[PDB]
Amino acid sequence: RSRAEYVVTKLDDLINWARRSSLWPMTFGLACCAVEMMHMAAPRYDMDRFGVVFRASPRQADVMIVAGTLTNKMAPALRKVYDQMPEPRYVVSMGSCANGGGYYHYSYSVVRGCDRIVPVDIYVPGCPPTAEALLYGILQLQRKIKREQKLKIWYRR
Amino acid sequence: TYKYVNKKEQESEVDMKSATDNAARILMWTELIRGLGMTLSYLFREPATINYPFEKGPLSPRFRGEHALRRYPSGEERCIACKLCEAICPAQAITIEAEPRADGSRRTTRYDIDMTKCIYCGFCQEACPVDAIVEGPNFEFSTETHEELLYNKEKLLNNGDKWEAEIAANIQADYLYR
Amino acid sequence: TQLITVDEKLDITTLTGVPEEHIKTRKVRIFVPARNNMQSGVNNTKKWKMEFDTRERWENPLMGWASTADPLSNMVLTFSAKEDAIAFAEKNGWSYDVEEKKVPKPKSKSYGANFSWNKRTRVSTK
Amino acid sequence: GSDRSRFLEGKRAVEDKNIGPLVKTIMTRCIQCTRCIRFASEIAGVDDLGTTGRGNDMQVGTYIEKMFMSELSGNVIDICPVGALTSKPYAFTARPWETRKTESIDVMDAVGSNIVVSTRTGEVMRILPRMHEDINEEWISDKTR
Amino acid sequence: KVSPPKRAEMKTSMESLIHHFKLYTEGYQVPPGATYTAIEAPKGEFGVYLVSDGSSRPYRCKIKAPGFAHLAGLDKMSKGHMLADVVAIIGTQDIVFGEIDR
Amino acid sequence: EMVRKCDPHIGLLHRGTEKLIEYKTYLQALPYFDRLDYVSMMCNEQAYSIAV
Amino acid sequence: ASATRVIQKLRNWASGQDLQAKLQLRYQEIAKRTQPPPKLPVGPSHKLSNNYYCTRDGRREVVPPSIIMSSQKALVEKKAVTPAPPMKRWELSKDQPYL
Amino acid sequence: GVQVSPSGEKITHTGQVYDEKDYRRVRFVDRQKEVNENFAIDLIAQQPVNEVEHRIIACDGGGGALGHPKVYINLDKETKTGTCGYCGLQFKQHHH
Amino acid sequence: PTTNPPTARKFIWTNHKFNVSATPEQYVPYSTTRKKIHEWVPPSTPYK
Amino acid sequence: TSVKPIFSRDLNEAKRRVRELYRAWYREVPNTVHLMQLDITVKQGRDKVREMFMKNAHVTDPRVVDLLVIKGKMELQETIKVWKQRTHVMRFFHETETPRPKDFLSKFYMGHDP
Amino acid sequence: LHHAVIPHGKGGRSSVSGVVATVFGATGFLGRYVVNHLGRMGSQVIIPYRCDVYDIMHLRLMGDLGQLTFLEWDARDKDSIRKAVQHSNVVINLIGREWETRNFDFEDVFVNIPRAIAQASKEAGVERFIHVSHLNASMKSSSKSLRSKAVGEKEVRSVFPEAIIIRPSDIFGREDRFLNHFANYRWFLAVPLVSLGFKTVKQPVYVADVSKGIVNATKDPDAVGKTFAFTGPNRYLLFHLVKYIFGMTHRTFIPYPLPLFVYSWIGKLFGLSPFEPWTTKDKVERIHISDVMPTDLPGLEDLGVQPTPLELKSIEVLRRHRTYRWLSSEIEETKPAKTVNY
Amino acid sequence: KRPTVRPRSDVTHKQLSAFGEYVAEILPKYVQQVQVSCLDELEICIHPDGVIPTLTFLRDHTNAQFKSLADLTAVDVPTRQNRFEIVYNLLSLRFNSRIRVKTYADELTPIDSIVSVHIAANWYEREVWDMFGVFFFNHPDLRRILTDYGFEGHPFRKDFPLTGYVELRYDDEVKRVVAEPVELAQEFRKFDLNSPWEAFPAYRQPPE
Ligand SMILES: COC1=C(OC)C(=O)C(C/C=C(\C)CC/C=C(\C)CC/C=C(\C)CC/C=C(/C)CC/C=C(/C)CC/C=C(\C)CC/C=C(\C)CC/C=C(\C)CC/C=C(/C)CCC=C(C)C)=C(C)C1=O
Ligand SMILES: NC(=O)C1=CN([C@@H]2O[C@H](COP(=O)(O)OP(=O)(O)OC[C@H]3O[C@@H](n4cnc5c(N)ncnc54)[C@H](OP(=O)(O)O)[C@@H]3O)[C@@H](O)[C@H]2O)C=CC1
Ligand code: SF4
Ligand code: SF4
Ligand code: SF4
Ligand code: SF4
Ligand code: SF4
Ligand SMILES: [K+]
Ligand SMILES: [Zn+2]
């Protein structure tokens, strides 16, 4: 193909490499799934070794790991801290509660899955999913944003 | 019985040596230095970090992972549409519809498990009288859409066909306990 | 000084928080449930039950599940007495249909009638 | 009963019968309670069922290959306490805890038999009778059922 | 009639199969009555007020969590303190919120 | 930075657990207690088991 | 466990504890992942006689609570009592009374 | 065995397939409808009939406690094999 | 599984598949039951 | 037919409490619209408050009126101290929810619900 | 009808509206509101997309599970177009750019792609086609985009004779390029209007009103083969409109009369950008083209939508462009613009 | 002796019966019923007017010393005139005992709060009001504690549906989290898990 197309593809690879090697989650959790999330932070699995480091403010966050039961009282707050994240942001639902309500699906005060509130990039199943499974979801998200072709789509526009 | 965690018994009085020891403790930061030494020892230890995904954390044959539907060695489905798993499912994550098959066998026409609704508790696999539904040890089945976690009978039978070499071995290692 | 008079219907619909549709458009049924004819046990015919009229259940396009739109579809309330269920229904402002309890009729049973000399109750087999 | 079994022997097994496409017979489950025999003798008035044999080999049914088809013949499916006489259209379809019960009236004739419609997930699964002493007692016709 | 039998007994015995069926479909019937059972949980006294109406489902299950009373008493403990002191008090009350909210 | 009043608003993790328990059976209501205090799972199991 | 003796002495001096005796990493002392098959024992009711369920039916020995007094049923010098005898004072630990 | 519709869509072992005018094939557009290839009805049809000697046989599906609950099949009808209601294995009494 | 291979069954997959999410080979759910209510088909011949 | 009062012996001081609560809501509406960045005007908020009061206007039991006043004061406090958010305040307007028509023909065309 | 297309439920998220709609411009400004309304009533929305999956992530929560089918498509790929419209009873065309790229120009975007979509829809036998043109895109207009939309209207009518043609005015909304454009005029010194913003009449229409009109066109039996004119209730001069916009922003207001030829020159200068330009020559020409008065054409009222006024829905757009000083300002603190009957 | 049946001690039953007689004769103005369960638990059912005197007496009496309120809750039995049964479980550390005090209420008769007796009753009565609608007199700040802001209805009541009446979702047209009437993709399948045969003959109610 064109020489400029190759340059654009390599720039896409570089941008995707940077964004997948530096994934900072918001220090945000709701329940037992967030307990497994800090067990992923624990020395056995070392998200920091993978380059994944928690940041407290949503402004410095890249991904949002919805780890727990999203209730009706919590949903505006979750939407607010999602909206306050800057644009290259991703969402990892974790556990059956955040996926589709889970054990509290038919409850009066539970949002039936956080995908009703925020656009979810990756769903991690389990109750709780193990820290292995959450780490697998993080690596799958890294592959997904490695697959992104933003500058190539912009060039083909 | 009970014990005191902070109450001190009697007094140590006052001595020049004890006063000098407390003065050196305050001025020279002795407990801070030994905390530094503890962190230094941890630095020179060996980390407990495995090399995921090339190394996996240990598990047991009892592990409750992705659901699957098993078969007899003849290839006939083990499930007989008895809805015990559906009855005992605490999250109501199982939907079962059934009818007699063309040969008159009692088989399901719909076996759906909402893995976004399931709580991964194993009540289905411990209520199944024929060991049809199991939680095989797969846990790395995260998807990118909510729909792909809504399993039906074809997905569960494909999981049972995929993981039969491991599920059968786990049930062989486990069934004497249960 | 601590006792007033109220000559009203005891309406708490404004306090229950139910939407107006699910009060006015709803019909409830107060009845002793019939004995399930597959069994001979009668312990489920002891208490009064109040249930609601059945609304639409349709098919979910994605999965074929039974989707519903009314919240009072699984609502069954148990009462010790018919007048207690009446009081609860009038208090919550629901129109009701009341079915009187169907007590089984007493029956004259005689084992010796199976071997009657002249009557037709003599059986031909055992 | 007790919570466990002391029976260490082998069980008996009985070949099934083919009394018709309405009533499915799995006669191994039969406990020889003669409810179907008494019903067919006294209410249906057909005298086609009975016990052949003796002792532990006593079997309920018809000695010959006979199709037991009168009206009011699903009530043996009702009154059989075990699942020896089940319903063939209802075979393997649902469970009683699944089925929601709706008390309604039959319109297939002008008797007006009180019935229960068993519906699961918005689909009519079964028709059972209702106890009304002044109309249909405990039974419904085969067309109704 | 309360605990399920072994799987071999269920697959070889009629009574065990019947009891397995009924326990995993309906469950055992608890005789009607009310109790409050308190257990020394790590976070404090974990209580269950169970009311059984005689059926196989509990009529009422109130869960008493120690964190509920501790967080109710958080405001009293924070008098004359700063933000970091409040953080320390929340940490030392051993607070988890699933049992608080239920 | 002095603290004049604390008002803990809770219920942001309220899921109607008691109502779901009263709509489920006892064995079905057991794994709710794992998720009540999700650091003391076996202890809540023991509490519910001793009550039943 | 693969640490050199120099690093082991450095770690032990820096921590003040003998770390090599109690390592936090499991190497070989753990059980094998494959085990011989078990044979679990049976309970006390696994007997073929004198095992009627009515003699061990603890669930049906529950009675309704006994009414000490009622406003409708009863229709109503002794010493004052307590719900229980007062709780005995705990003894101080003979193992380690103070930290 | 797996058969295809006139639309080309695979028919499952339950016989389910979307119609030609059904809009719900758009969920399979640019994706795949996965169908379990091994049909249990054909697989249990492939099993030979076990020739036993007794009038009543016992089946548990094999493996003892790993199989189904142990049932007894009465092989009195000489014009029809006895089928186990759980595992689908067929048995016939050898009268020679 | 070189000194102790698993039991061979004819229905076991001979080729393992990894996670096929966000691929054309991904799993798409559908109702596995057939149609329950059958509509009346009007006749193709006019009455007059 | 003789019951224990909550706060009001009869309907007059119950209506007095209702008027006090309406006064408090009427004063608090402009502050809410200024503080929470609401798209609505002050006229719309007071219209909504009047609509809620007129929705509850049909009751004649003093105890029910007292409990309605207590609930209204709880919601008023939740609006004064900013605990209700913009979403919680705008939930009174149902602007995303289409209304079901009240005529028989439209209810017949839509579905089986009466 | 098919048994799976019969409507069911009460019209909520989990209901069935019986609408299988392939929405082509769903990734843009109007498309997100159209998809939101369709998924809100509960519909099978097929989204053929060209941009990134990240760029279509915001649409993923607008419907229930399995009710939104995203699939890649190419505007040069008739096979992709026909596989998008193969299972649909409504095809909605919202394809459009406000500028020209080196790959797609105004002629392709507004004629060739709509003709291809309508041709594929007619071959696939969909029941209803809805095409969004522009108001006052009649023919022989001063701007190339409006002439292109006129030719596209003619081609869509020739291929699909019963196509519902919807011509809205300048749509305003949260993510629009009309109110946000005039608010982003504050980043320069003055507001360069042609003839000081007079003799230019506009009646902007709310994006939710347009989307409700489009959905009611999917459902309406009497809308087939008609051309609708979607306009707001009030017509404003361009000067008074920009004055009201800056008044709602509370920023400042310094108008400046700039002649149209040099205004088109600086619009071209802004338009020669590799990314999305701030403005183009076609953009300033469409700004200074007056809106015609819809007399014979039906509109939002005839499709069952009450036109919400700009005075009512203005603060949800322009509050972002304020500073901290004027951030908490109500509706009533801004004087509404003077309307004109002509 | 029997390995499957709970051992029973009669001394606790005797002590609780004696203390129930003690409290009943001390407070005949309010005590309506005194019972001791077979699980050795003492329950005293009182008039709602005597909640403050009964709780104060149990906390401050020398022979009671029930200084710790274990919990406060309500049970909705919607077949009696006063549907809400208010239950106070109390702990005496001095005598190592537990007691239960019951009273009744309906939707329109509030009962006195015992915040002046126990401070935990503040949040406990807030929960009771939020979940059942039982108002409490003289509460320092009574409001909702677990439901969402603006939640209508008291969800722990029997007649309140399990799924509620409204559900939340993010609407992109209004850019907010909005409440809609509840629609479920799959309805909660209720089960009739009641055997038609009587299980406990000791609790057989007489026929009506
Ligand atoms: C039981 O109850 C509960 C709780 O209670 C206990 C909960 O809590 C709870 C909530 C639970 C959670 C939210 C889970 C959260 C998990 C934890 C709290 C545990 C995890 C632990 C930590 C967060 C502690 C981490 C500690 C560390 C030491 C890690 C280090 C972290 C840091 C932030 C510091 C390091 C910094 C970074 C990672 C970023 C640094 C790098 C940069 C910013 C780069 C800057 C560099 C440049 C710009 C240089 C550029 C210039 C050049 C010249 C370069 C040249 C370039 C070229 C291209 C050539 C729940 C739900 C709960 O139920
Ligand atoms: N916006 C307005 O003020 C008005 C608009 N209209 C018309 O309404 C329609 C929708 O408006 P609006 O939302 O503002 O438009 P947008 O600028 O937001 O773009 C609409 C959609 O067109 C798609 N698109 C554009 N060019 C191509 C192409 N070459 N191939 C594939 N897809 C393409 C875009 O997809 P992607 O993002 O992937 O490139 C986008 O999703 C347009 O036809 C417009 O002319 C009418 C009146 C006023
Ligand atoms: S999915 Fe399970 S483990 Fe995760 S938050 Fe929900 S209850 Fe806890
Ligand atoms: S593991 Fe538990 S929650 Fe999941 S399907 Fe089985 S019974 Fe249901
Ligand atoms: S419990 Fe087992 S046999 Fe019964 S329906 Fe479930 S999977 Fe099938
Ligand atoms: S009714 Fe059933 S159990 Fe009784 S004799 Fe007839 S077949 Fe046997
Ligand atoms: S359910 Fe009843 S009839 Fe059927 S096999 Fe079991 S005990 Fe026999
Ligand atoms: K039967
Ligand atoms: Zn078998």
UniProtKB/Swiss-Prot annotation, chain B:
Keyword flag Translocase: yes
Binding site residues for [4Fe-4S] cluster 2: C89, C118, C121, C124
Presence of the UniProt keyword Repeat in the record: yes
Enzyme Commission numbers on file: 7.1.1.2
Domain 4Fe-4S ferredoxin-type: 70-99, 109-138
Superkingdom field: Eukaryota
Subunit record text: Complex I is composed of 45 different subunits. This is a component of the iron-sulfur (IP) fragment of the enzyme. Interacts with RAB5IF.
Name of this chain's protein: NADH dehydrogenase [ubiquinone] iron-sulfur protein 8, mitochondrial
Species assigned in the record: Mus musculus (Mouse)
Gene that this polypeptide is encoded by: Ndufs8
From Swiss-Prot, chain F:
Chain positions found as Symmetric dimethylarginine: R15
Compartment(s) where it occurs, according to its Swiss-Prot or TrEMBL record: Mitochondrion inner membrane
Domain of life: Eukaryota
Recorded phenotype for the gene knockout or disruption: Knockout mice show early perinatal death and major defects in the CNS, compromising especially the postnatal development of dorsal cortex, corpus callosum, hippocampus and cerebellum. Neonatal neurogenesis and gliogenesis are deeply impaired.
Post-translational events: Dimethylation at Arg-15 by NDUFAF7 takes place after NDUFS2 assembles into the complex I, leading to stabilize the early intermediate complex.
Subunit-structure text: Core subunit of respiratory chain NADH dehydrogenase (Complex I) which is composed of 45 different subunits. Component of the iron-sulfur (IP) fragment of the enzyme. Interacts with NDUFAF3. Interacts with NDUFAF7. Interacts with CERS2.
Family: Belongs to the complex I 49 kDa subunit family.
Cited function: Core subunit of the mitochondrial membrane respiratory chain NADH dehydrogenase (Complex I) which catalyzes electron transfer from NADH through the respiratory chain, using ubiquinone as an electron acceptor. Essential for the catalytic activity and assembly of complex I. Redox-sensitive, critical component of the oxygen-sensing pathway in the pulmonary vasculature which plays a key role in acute pulmonary oxygen-sensing and hypoxic pulmonary vasoconstriction. Plays an important role in carotid body sensing of hypoxia.
Gene that this sequence comes from: Ndufs2
Curated annotation (Swiss-Prot), chain G:
Membrane topology: Peripheral membrane protein
Residues bearing PTM N-acetylalanine: A1
Biological process, per Gene Ontology: aerobic respiration; ATP synthesis coupled electron transport; proton motive force-driven mitochondrial ATP synthesis
Compositional bias segments (type: Basic and acidic residues): 88-99
Modification N6-acetyllysine occurs at: K39
Source organism superkingdom: Eukaryota
Keyword Transport: yes
InterPro entries documented for this protein: NDUA7
UniProt keywords, alphabetically: Acetylation, Electron transport, Membrane, Mitochondrion, Mitochondrion inner membrane, Phosphoprotein, Respiratory chain, Transport
Locations listed in the record: Mitochondrion inner membrane
Stretch list, region Disordered: 77-99
Modified residues (Phosphothreonine): T82
Cellular compartments per GO CC: mitochondrial inner membrane; mitochondrion; respiratory chain complex I
Function: Accessory subunit of the mitochondrial membrane respiratory chain NADH dehydrogenase (Complex I), that is believed not to be involved in catalysis. Complex I functions in the transfer of electrons from NADH to the respiratory chain. The immediate electron acceptor for the enzyme is believed to be ubiquinone.
PANTHER family per record: NADH DEHYDROGENASE [UBIQUINONE] 1 ALPHA SUBCOMPLEX SUBUNIT 7, NADH-UBIQUINONE OXIDOREDUCTASE SUBUNIT B
Subunit-level organization: Complex I is composed of 45 different subunits.
Record-stated family: Belongs to the complex I NDUFA7 subunit family.
Protein name as catalogued: NADH dehydrogenase [ubiquinone] 1 alpha subcomplex subunit 7
Organism of derivation: Mus musculus
Gene: Ndufa7
Curated annotation (Swiss-Prot), chain L:
Family indicated by similarity: Belongs to the complex I 30 kDa subunit family.
Subcellular location: Mitochondrion inner membrane
A GO CC term assigned to this protein in UniProt: mitochondrion
EC assignment: 7.1.1.2
Keywords: Electron transport, Membrane, Mitochondrion, Mitochondrion inner membrane, NAD, Oxidoreductase, Respiratory chain, Transit peptide, Translocase, Transport, Ubiquinone
Purpose: Core subunit of the mitochondrial membrane respiratory chain NADH dehydrogenase (Complex I) which catalyzes electron transfer from NADH through the respiratory chain, using ubiquinone as an electron acceptor. Essential for the catalytic activity and assembly of complex I.
Protein name: NADH dehydrogenase [ubiquinone] iron-sulfur protein 3, mitochondrial
Summary of subunit composition and partner proteins: Core subunit of respiratory chain NADH dehydrogenase (Complex I) which is composed of 45 different subunits. Interacts with NDUFAF3. Interacts with RAB5IF. Found in subcomplexes containing subunits NDUFS2, MT-ND1 and NDUFA13.
Membrane topology reported for the UniProt record: Peripheral membrane protein
Enzyme class: translocase
Catalytic reaction list: a ubiquinone + NADH + 5 H(+)(in) = a ubiquinol + NAD(+) + 4 H(+)(out)
Biological process terms in GO annotation: aerobic respiration; mitochondrial electron transport, NADH to ubiquinone; mitochondrial respiratory chain complex I assembly; proton motive force-driven mitochondrial ATP synthesis; reactive oxygen species metabolic process
Taxonomic superkingdom: Eukaryota
Residues of the full protein shown: 42 to 249 of 263
Main location: mitochondrion
